[PDB]
DNA sequence: GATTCGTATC
DNA sequence: GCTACGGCTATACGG
DNA sequence: GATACGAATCTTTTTTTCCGTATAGCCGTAGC
């Protein structure tokens, strides 16, 4: 078969996972098999090929035949289309029959093949069906494990209606905050496989192919290809597939693995401090725009640059550089989201931070923009102002525009009503102003 | 019926021999038809160059009287989304040609307005049914076409119409309409054409309407300038001389008098002064940089409106300040 | 009865003044039947809408107008679907049979007219979906595009449409039309008036007619039987009085930032429009003989920049203060 | 009237006729002779032989079983979540008696245009049925295929075709068709091709049809030099009076639209060498302002002349 | 009610702050049949809306102040319930399309076109009438129309001028396009002088006894109001109730909290000029923007507070005003205001250092 | 990509 | 022989 | 014992097409 299917781990010691991560998964899973467990769903999130299900299966192999009140998992198959069932009801009938997999029929239900969540209605049905499992009144329920692979959704659906699920396939955009911040849900984020474990497993696979490796005069150059694959990728499946493709080859075809997408804070750090791989800013910016145009085009990135450019040296650079950066960002904001705007703003920020960059600079920590907090406080201000307006319409027949409200009605009007009451709203609209 | 038509539609070419200006493209497509092997074509050029007139005449030459059932013409006036490509174009290409003229022709006019999903889906319809159907893509902007679609199409560029072709078509129009045109009027029409036959025909129709008697009267340059509302070649030179030589009061008076003489706008004067200053032997390399940059901002501000007198004074001051560098 | 701008709207093509290069061409199409696709562009209030409304009437008559005319403006949706369905189906429609009265009184051309007024507000895709609609059905349907900015019309559509530029209506070509309206309404004005009205209304007859109507509504309210003077016209047009402008230029000549800032602060309270005081300063500074070539060259660009910033919808106080400070340091 | 265009008439039918990317074609030949084809993703610029390689590999791997062992789906066919869940699932579930080491092949041409839900269902499709059928994705930009799908595949990147492979294929076609040529004409055809076989064949066909003899004059009078190479020459000029001359003569009077020149200038500047980053970002800013002015309605020659003047001003300073 | 609405002139003869304007309004209302479309422009709080209502009361008689709120519902291209309050009277309508955002085009294209299409025939009356024949629509804040609602009005108020008339209230009529201003009669409303504001406040403190110690305290409020009658009448009530209805010469003038915060920001900018100070200024700007205060006013007050600093030379102020103009133009042609509001501050501190 | 805390190993 | 109503199916619409 | 390595944290508020469900119209069949 394929080397990632024939050289699959047989026990937990052969799984490419960190020791601490394995310990936290093991203890959490063991706790979820108790009669009345505090955690009902275990949400495993991370990149592709991180042994997320490759650890769940081999842990179930030793966990399920320990608590079965006298051996494997029950995985949801989304592609199953039965005769008399709506497509959106396929997961409901799976969760309604999976809840019977309890004592004397115990089985860890694993949901790796998620239902179609790019369609809004079935995504909402999935969310409310998970909420109906977290808030279930059943005295005993089987352990539920949901594996979600964090992958960036590529540029498609040219409509401007791109939602979060249209940008990144992550647990945040599939689940809601009620599920994600539930007392009975445990989240264990997974990290890409480190170079040491990848090297060890690719060397075990090589000593299991030593005969064929030596016959094709490829056994002394195995160290360099394992090192290159370990340094280039963090995907175990992609690493083994590339190793198999290189071994079964008989030529000088170059080693090429899959491509990974950077993070939002990773891209911010690349724009600010530069990349260690290349000292050419033009090449780095061009590759960042080529591979990650879905993130460099969103306005929140240009906002994050303005929010985090002060972390270069904890805020101890020249004011002229900061003025140039913010002026360039303001000028880019007037280009109506053209491709030439981001490619100029990021280039100017990188050029500004390159010249002032000196050795020994103790940089700061970047953060996400607070624009959303301001936008929600604006909506709260709107709600309170409309409450002021409608409560000030029948008691005292008067119409006033919201622009006049945000200037003189919210400081003066409470200062009159509360002063008339110190002897009908009486508080400042939108809360007090600070600093 | 055809005499109650606008001149831009009445004088549409019906055969490939009536398409002027584009000699290399026509002498290639005619041999392509003569050999009988027509590849997938791409016609590119400015508006009013003769791309649609070429492709319709070519299809008429190939198909004769069977143009109705053998040619599918889809343009921007019809929906051409992913479903349209996957159904209408695909069933037109897949079905047989009733053994009429060998291969089918699909003309995609104004394909630059087509969405990228449709242009990407059309790539495996162009190269799969190429034995029975051929695609012709007409576009004015090549940046809106996917690179693969450009790759699977033979690109023919329609150049702006040369002066000789404009003169040859004007002669036919004058013969048909029994009109007389002075050589200076023809020169004015060709310089204002900017390589467009539609503009030539539209201006000629208005010039014929302007004449009190369509016959026994010749359309002079004055008639053309009055009809199209363009400054005369002397007014532009007078304004430029007043700006470059006279003081700030006399130049301001001369510009306003020239503009109020015939209700001349500022944008055409700006373009004329730009064209006249283009062939000027500047010797500082900053006079040109300042002139072009200031006149472009004035031209952009005029496009959004504003105070006209302030813009005219801005033009005068920009020219005067840019020519301060030269001396 | 009605506002004078609507009462004196041109009913026929002979009432459209100062635009003969286009009306002469349009009148010839009454005898012929070769009306082309038309693009009416020019300054606001020049008579583009009135000309097409008069041409439509003179071509069809009030009875055939309802069947042979489709008018779409910015007051209705003109998206890609509207252009590809409603306009295309109206162009594909068959020319209705003229009545015997219509054929015996009106020319009744064998085509209909689609009038797309305020075409500058249409998107580039709705305009792209119109090119083959006008070309294919040109023998049965004609198109009239009316706009103020010809740059907002795409080049493919502008090539297919005959361009008719409507000239700005100044005191040299609209004085007879204004005098006619003054005479029919029995408006008494001093000599020089009805020219100051057309000078204040830069290339706009609608604003001048409204200004004259407003002057008359005060003249017959005063009830003294006296002629309207240019001072009242300037007062009710928003023109800054010359004493205030002289004070502005005297404060500018001193060059002290604080006094100019205080004067601008007390001037913005009077409610004067920035585009008017900037325009008046332009006339004061450009035509004056006490300034050198360099000063005029610099201030021309300063006024151009100020006007361009003001046209974008910016704060008048900041722009006016910056302009006066820049002139004070020239 | 029944003669096929030279692009389709001389489309390779075996892997040995595919010039360029010698190592990758050799590896495809090893896959064809052995049989154990892995899941693969083929990416590259259009017209370098990505599709004609996958199809030839499927032919040489199946032969008489190609009719029932290959399911070819592309952008012209509907490839929603339902087709993947029904048609692809039934094709994968189908049991066909193929020789040893031979597997069914699902050729998903233009996989970069597939929706996200179909790509996510393809994960389960390849996971359940990897022992019987193998998937061969062919695309132009490999990042459009989701990372979970790329993890199960062996990425094969096709590079640009050099000037020697193009000449070899052109000479084979010339010998087959017996056309008259000279060396400079073929050099001009390769130069205008810019690493494109399909465009080189189309240009050679057009030149032969138009004139018959493939020389530089007849090639260049029907085919045009690549306008990115003229935009690069205009933007890299030393003094303004010849950059304006280039923009006028080779771009404006030739018929290229102003928006096309502006869009090409941006891509040229992004890849321009020997220019400082501070210069490059200012050039990008000026090109973006010019692009805004063109998009807002002012598509005139003066706006391009001003952009070149600003670029020269920033260059000299 | 508040003293701003209680002591509001409800007739054209009760206006007492501009007399050359009241006479022009009387001239307009003498023959209301041929009343053109009116555009009242001037500083905020001068009494433009009060004068519009007084003119409507002179035209259609009393009862135009009998306002009721009729909640409307609109649907845009993608189905979404967008709500607009319509304050209506038996003779006039008041709409604020800016309250619904960028989608005011649909409000102008549906509500205004439906109102302008109804002839208001009533009982017979097919010939003409001074009242109840044509209708008055008041568009408050005409400046915030997004250049597309102003395009749908050009033909709406021109073709249907017989059955509808428009009186739009606005300040600083720069963002109003030229075709809209061409169809309308421009009415300038100057701000009251300090003497007139003092007289109005004297009438208010005469009708309601606040025990004025000196007439100077009313003048100080007028000078602090900067021409705003509503603000002056609000501070009068504030210093009245906050001093147990007894105004003293030592009574502090109460100013809006955001103005005090802008002054504190100005002093911080003058004192500290560094990157961390710029980050603190960004926090202050974000807090100010969280209270739905428009960004153009933030920039205007920040600039005119920085120009009041006595420790700044003329070269610094001439650069501050230039940066203010540049960033105001950038803010007008922009999407997010924080970039420009931070760039202006950064350039100001980079110039003052 | 940066900082900070915590291991594992040579 | 005829009719009404439930089940099957094609189509416009929501998000 | 020095150090490389690794994990945690640094995050969220007009237009087109597609996927599954809703719904009314037409045919089949029980029956009175
Ligand atoms: N030593 C190893 N450790 C982990 N996985 C291994 C190992 N050797 C082979 N594999 C295979 O690598 C694959 C890893 O699968 P997982 O990472 O558990 O799935 P995943 O994380 O959901 O990836 P995606 O998102 O489905 S592509 C499985 O097919 C394993 O059989
Ligand atoms: N070479 C030509 N010879 C004669 N008339 C021409 C020529 N080119 C254009 N015309 C005239 O111009 C009209 C419009 O040209 P078309 O070919 O229909 O459009 P086009 O030239 O393809 O430009 P676009 O891209 O469609 S706007 C034709 O109907 C002819 O009347
Ligand atoms: N040449 C003219 N002769 C007589 N009246 C004119 C002339 N030009 C304009 N007017 C008057 O100007 C007023 C408005 O004219 P319209 O043509 O409707 O406006 P416009 O030219 O379309 O400007 P818009 O709508 O802003 S593009 C009417 O009262 C006309 O009578
Ligand atoms: N290496 C090659 N040798 C010979 N002909 C080639 C080669 N590469 C491409 N061609 C020709 O290119 C044409 C079609 O090539 P394709 O493989 O379909 O293009 P492609 O590389 O798949 O690019 P896309 O993305 O599918 S448009 C045929 O005429 C082939 O003969
Ligand atoms: N002539 C006047 N006499 C007394 N009070 C006035 C006068 N004009 C305006 N006001 C007061 O000013 C307050 C607000 O005026 P407003 O109509 O909001 O002005 P604007 O329309 O310019 O915003 C009103 O409450 C009113 O009491
Ligand atoms: Mg897995
Ligand atoms: Mg065409
Ligand atoms: Mg009009
Ligand atoms: Mg292909």
């Amino acid at each position: 078969e394929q080397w990632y299917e024939k050289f699959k781990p047989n026990c937990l010691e052969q799984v490419a996972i960190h020791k601490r991560k394995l310990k936290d998964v093991q203890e959490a899973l063991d706790a979820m098999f108790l009669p009345n467990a505090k955690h009902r769903i275990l949400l495993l999130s991370g990149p592709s090929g991180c042994s997320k299900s490759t650890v769940i299966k081999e842990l179930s192999k030793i966990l399920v035949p320990k608590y079965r009140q006298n051996h494997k998992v029950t995985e949801f198959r989304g592609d199953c289309i039965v005769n008399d069932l709506p497509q959106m009801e396929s997961f409901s009938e799976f969760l309604k029959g999976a809840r019977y997999l309890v004592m004397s029929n115990l089985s860890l239900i694993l949901i790796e093949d998620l239902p179609n969540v790019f369609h809004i209605d079935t995504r909402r049905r999935f969310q409310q069906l998970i909420l109906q499992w977290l808030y279930s009144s059943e005295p005993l329920l089987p352990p539920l494990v949901i594996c979600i692979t964090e992958c960036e959704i590529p540029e498609n659906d040219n409509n401007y209606r791109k939602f979060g699920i249209d940008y990144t396939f992550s647990a945040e955009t599939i689940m809601n905050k009620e599920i994600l911040m539930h007392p009975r849900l445990k989240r264990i984020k997974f990290n890409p496989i480190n170079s040491t474990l990848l090297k060890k497993h690719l060397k075990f696979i090589c000593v299991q192919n030593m005969k064929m490796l030596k016959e094709k005069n490829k056994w002394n150059k195995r160290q360099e290809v394992i090192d290159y694959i370990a340094q280039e990728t963090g995907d175990i499946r992609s690493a083994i597939t590339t190793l198999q493709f290189w071994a079964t080859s008989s030529g000088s075809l170059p080693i090429s693995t899959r491509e990974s997408t950077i993070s939002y804070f990773h891209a911010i750090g690349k724009v600010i401090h530069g990349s260690h791989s290349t000292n050419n800013d033009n090449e780095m910016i061009n590759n960042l725009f080529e591979n990650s145009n879905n993130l460099l085009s969103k306005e929140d990135f240009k906002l994050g640059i303005l929010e985090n450019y002060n972390t270069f040296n904890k805020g101890e650079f020249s004011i002229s550089d900061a003025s140039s950066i913010v002026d360039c960002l303001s000028e880019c904001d007037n280009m109506n989201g053209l491709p030439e705007s981001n490619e100029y703003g990021l280039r100017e920020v990188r050029k500004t931070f390159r010249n002032i960059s000196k050795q020994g600079h103790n940089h700061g920590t970047v953060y996400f923009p607070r624009e959303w907090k301001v936008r929600k406080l604006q909506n709260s201000f709107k709600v309170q102002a409309e409450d002021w307006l409608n409560v000030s319409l029948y008691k005292y027949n008067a119409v006033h525009s919201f622009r006049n409200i945000t200037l003189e009605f919210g400081y003066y009007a409470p200062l009159i009503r509360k002063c008339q009451s110190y002897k009908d709203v009486v508080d400042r609209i939108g809360g007090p102003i600070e600093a | 019926s055809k005499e109650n038509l606008p001149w831009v539609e009445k004088y549409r070419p019906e055969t490939l021999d009536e398409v002027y200006g584009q000699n290399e493209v026509i002498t290639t497509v005619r041999k392509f038809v003569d050999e009988g092997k027509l590849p997938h074509l791409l016609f590119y050029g400015p508006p009013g160059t003769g791309k649609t007139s070429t492709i319709v005449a070519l299809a008429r030459e190939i198909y004769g009287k069977n143009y109705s059932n053998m040619v599918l013409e889809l343009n921007a006036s019809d929906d051409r989304g992913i479903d349209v490509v996957r159904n209408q174009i695909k069933d037109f290409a897949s079905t047989r040609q009733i053994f009429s003229k060998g291969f089918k022709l699909i003309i995609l006019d104004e394909a630059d307005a087509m969405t990228n999903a449709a242009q990407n889906a059309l790539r495996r319809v162009i190269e799969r049914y190429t034995k029975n159907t051929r695609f012709c893509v007409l576009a004015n902007y090549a940046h809106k076409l996917t690179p693969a679609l450009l790759s699977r199409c033979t690109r023919f560029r329609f150049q702006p119409l040369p002066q000789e072709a404009i003169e040859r078509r004007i002669a036919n129009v004058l013969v048909h309409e029994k009109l007389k045109l002075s050589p200076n009027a023809e020169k004015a029409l060709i310089e204002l054409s900017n390589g467009d036959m539609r503009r030539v025909l539209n201006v000629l129709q208005s010039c014929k309407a302007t004449l009190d008697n369509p016959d026994e009267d010749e359309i002079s340059d004055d008639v053309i300038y009055e009809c199209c509302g363009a400054p005369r070649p002397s007014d532009l030179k007078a304004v430029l001389k007043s700006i470059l030589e006279d003081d700030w009061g006399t130049a301001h008076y001369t510009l306003n008098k020239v503009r109020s003489a015939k209700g001349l706008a500022l944008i055409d004067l700006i373009e004329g002064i730009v064209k006249i200053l283009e062939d000027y032997e500047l010797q500082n390399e900053e006079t040109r940089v300042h002139l072009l940059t200031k006149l472009a901002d004035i031209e952009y501000s005029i496009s959004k409106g504003g105070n006209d007198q302030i813009q005219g004074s801005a033009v005068i001051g920009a020219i005067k300040a840019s020519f301060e560098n030269e001396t | 009865q009605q506002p004078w701008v609507e009462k004196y709207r041109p009913k026929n093509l002979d009432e459209v003044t100062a635009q003969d290069h286009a009306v002469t061409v349009l009148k010839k199409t009454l005898k012929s039947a070769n009306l082309p696709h038309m693009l009416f562009y020019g300054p606001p209030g020049t008579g583009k809408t009135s000309t097409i409304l008069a041409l439509t009437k003179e071509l069809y008559g009030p009875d055939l107008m309802k069947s042979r005319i489709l008018e779409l403006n910015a007051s209705d949706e003109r998206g890609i679907s509207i252009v590809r369905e409603k306009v295309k189906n109206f162009a594909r429609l068959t020319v209705s049979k003229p009545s015997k009265h219509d054929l015996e009184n009106y020319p009744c051309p064998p085509y209909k007219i689609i009038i797309l007024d305020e075409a500058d507000s249409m998107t580039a895709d709705a305009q792209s979906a119109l090119r083959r609609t006008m070309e294919t059905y040109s023998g049965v349907t004609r198109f009239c595009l009316i706009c103020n900015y010809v740059t907002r019309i795409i080049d493919p559509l502008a090539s297919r449409c005959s361009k008719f530029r409507f000239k700005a209506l100044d005191a040299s070509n609209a004085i007879d039309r204004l005098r006619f309206i003054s005479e029919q309404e029995n408006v008494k004005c001093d000599d020089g008036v009805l020219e100051r009205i057309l000078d204040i209304s830069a290339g706009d007859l609608r604003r001048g007619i409204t200004l004259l109507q407003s002057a008359s509504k005060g003249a017959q309210y005063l009830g003294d039987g006296k002629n309207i003077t240019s001072t009242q016209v300037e007062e009710l047009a928003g023109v800054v009085p010359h004493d205030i402008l002289i004070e502005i230029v005297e404060k500018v000549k001193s060059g002290d930032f604080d006094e100019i800032k205080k004067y601008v602060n007390t001037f913005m309270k009077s409610g004067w429009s920035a585009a008017s005081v900037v325009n008046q300063l332009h006339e004061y500074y450009i035509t004056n003989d006490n300034f050198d070539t360099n000063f005029k060259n610099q201030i021309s660009w300063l006024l151009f920049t100020t006007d361009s910033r003001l046209n974008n919808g910016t704060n008048e106080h900041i722009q006016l203060l910056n302009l006066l400070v820049k002139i004070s340091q020239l | 009237s029944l003669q096929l265009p030279w692009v389709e008439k001389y489309r390779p039918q075996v892997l040995s006729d595919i010039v360029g990317n010698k190592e990758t074609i050799d590896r495809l030949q090893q896959i064809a002779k052995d049989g154990n084809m892995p899941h693969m993703i083929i990416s590259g610029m259009p017209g370098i032989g990505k599709t004609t390689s996958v199809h030839c590999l499927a032919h040489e791997l199946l032969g008489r079983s190609y009719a029932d062992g290959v399911l070819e789906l592309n952008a012209s066919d509907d490839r929603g979540i339902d087709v993947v869940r029904n048609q692809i699932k039934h094709f994968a579930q189908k049991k066909l008696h193929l020789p040893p080491g031979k597997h069914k092949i699902v050729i998903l041409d233009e996989a970069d245009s597939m929706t996200a839900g179909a790509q996510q269902a393809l994960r389960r499709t390849m996971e359940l049925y990897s022992n019987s059928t193998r998937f061969a994705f062919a695309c132009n930009q490999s990042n459009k295929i989701i990372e979970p799908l790329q993890s199960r595949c062996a990425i094969l990147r096709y590079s640009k075709l050099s000037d020697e492979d193009v000449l070899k294929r052109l000479l084979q076609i010339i010998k087959l068709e017996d056309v008259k040529y000279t060396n400079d004409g073929l050099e001009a055809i390769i130069f205008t091709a810019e690493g494109d076989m399909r465009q080189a064949i189309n240009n050679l066909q057009s030149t032969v049809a138009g004139h018959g003899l493939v020389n530089a004059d007849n090639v260049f009078k029907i085919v045009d030099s690549p306008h990115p190479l003229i935009v690069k020459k205009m933007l890299l000029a030393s003094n303004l009076e010849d950059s304006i001359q280039i923009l006028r003569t080779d771009l404006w009077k030739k018929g290229y639209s102003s928006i096309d020149i502006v869009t090409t200038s941006f891509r040229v500047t992004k890849n321009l060498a020997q220019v400082k980053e501070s210069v490059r970002l200012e050039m990008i800013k000026e090109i973006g302002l010019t692009h805004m002015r063109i998009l807002e309605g002012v598509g005139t020659y003066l706006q391009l002349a001003s952009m070149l003047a600003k670029i020269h001003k920033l260059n000299n300073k | 009610s508040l003293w701003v609405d209680k002591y509001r002139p409800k007739s054209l003869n009760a206006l007492s702050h501009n007399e050359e304007l009241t006479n022009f309004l009387k001239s307009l209302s003498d023959q209301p049949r041929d009343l053109p479309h009116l555009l009242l422009y001037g500083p905020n709080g001068t009494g433009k809306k009060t004068r519009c209502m007084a003119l409507l009361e002179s035209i259609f008689g009393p009862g135009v102040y009998r306002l009721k709120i009729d909640v409307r519902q609109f649907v845009t291209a993608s189905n979404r319930k967008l709500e607009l309050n319509v304050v209506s009277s038996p003779y006039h309508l008041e709409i604020t399309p800016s309250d619904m955002g960028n989608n005011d085009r649909i409000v102008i294209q549906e509500l205004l076109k439906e109102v302008a299409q109804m002839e208001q025939v009533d009982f017979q009356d097919s010939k003409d009438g001074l009242a109840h024949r044509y209708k008055c629509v008041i568009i408050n804040e005409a400046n915030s129309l997004t250049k597309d609602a102003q395009a749908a009005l050009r033909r709406t108020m021109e073709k249907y001028s017989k059955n509808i008339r428009l009186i739009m209230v606005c300040d600083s009529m720069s963002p109003i396009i030229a075709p809209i201003k061409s169809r309308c009669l421009l009415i300038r409303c100057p701000a009251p002088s300090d003497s007139e504001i003092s007289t109005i406040l004297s009438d208010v403190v005469t009708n309601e006894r606040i025990q004025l110690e000196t007439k100077d305290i009313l003048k100080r409020i007028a000078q602090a109001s900067n021409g705003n009658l509503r603000v002056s009448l609000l501070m009068l009530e504030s210093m009245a109730l906050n001093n147990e209805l007894a105004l003293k010469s030592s009574s502090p003038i109460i100013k809006p909290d955001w103005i005090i915060v802008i002054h504190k920001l100005t002093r911080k900018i003058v004192k500290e000029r560094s990157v961390n100070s710029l980050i603190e200024c960004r926090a202050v700007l974000y807090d100010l923007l969280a209270h739905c205060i428009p960004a153009n006013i933030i920039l205007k007050e920040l600039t005119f507070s920085l120009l009041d600093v006595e420790t700044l030379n003329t070269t610094n102020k001439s650069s501050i005003i230039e940066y203010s103009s540049v960033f105001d133009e950038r803010l007008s042609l922009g999407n997010k205001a924080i970039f420009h509001l931070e760039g202006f501050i950064a350039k100001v501190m980079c110039c003052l250092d």
Side-chain angles (χ1 to χ4, degrees), chain A residues 3-5 7-9 14-17 46-55 112 147-150 193 201 205 235-237 240, chain D residues 123 127 147-149 151-152:
Chain A
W3 281 7
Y4 68 78
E5 148 176 359
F7 294 117
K8 50 176 299 185
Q14 306 175 19
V15 187
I17 194 179
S48 57
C50 281
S51 316
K52 292 197 306 297
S53 54
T54 304
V55 75
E112 162 116 287
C147 296
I148 295 190
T149 288
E150 262 75 344
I193 322 295
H201 291 88
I205 296 181
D235 197 315
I236 181 64
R237 176 154 40 207
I240 304 171
Chain D
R123 289 172 37 179
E127 217 47 32
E147 298 167 26
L149 278 182
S151 167
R152 302 175 168 86

Side-chain angles (χ1 to χ4, degrees), chain E residues 256-333:
Chain E
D257 37 356
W258 66 282
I259 302 264
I260 267 66
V261 164
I262 289 186
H263 281 124
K264 292 162 43 60
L265 188 73
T266 293
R267 285 191 276 100
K268 156 184 272 296
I269 290 174
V270 171
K271 218 191 55 83
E272 310 146 86
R273 297 169 303 275
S274 61
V275 182
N276 287 317
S277 178
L278 185 57
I279 308 315
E280 278 143 31
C281 292
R282 184 160 71 240
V284 171
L285 287 180
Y286 270 133
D287 170 80
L288 286 168
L289 280 173
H291 295 291
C292 298
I293 276 149
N296 37 294
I297 313 297
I298 301 197
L299 179 80
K300 179 196 175 307
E301 310 310 343
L302 190 57
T303 298
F304 289 130
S305 291
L306 279 153
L307 295 184
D308 285 338
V309 179
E310 334 272 2
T311 89
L312 297 190
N313 35 299
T314 169
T315 88
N316 287 349
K317 292 178 176 181
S318 63
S319 305
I320 289 172
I321 193 53
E322 204 196 15
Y323 299 150
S324 201
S325 322
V326 166
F327 280 97
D328 205 282
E329 208 227 359
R330 300 247 266 263
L331 237 163
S332 172
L333 304 155

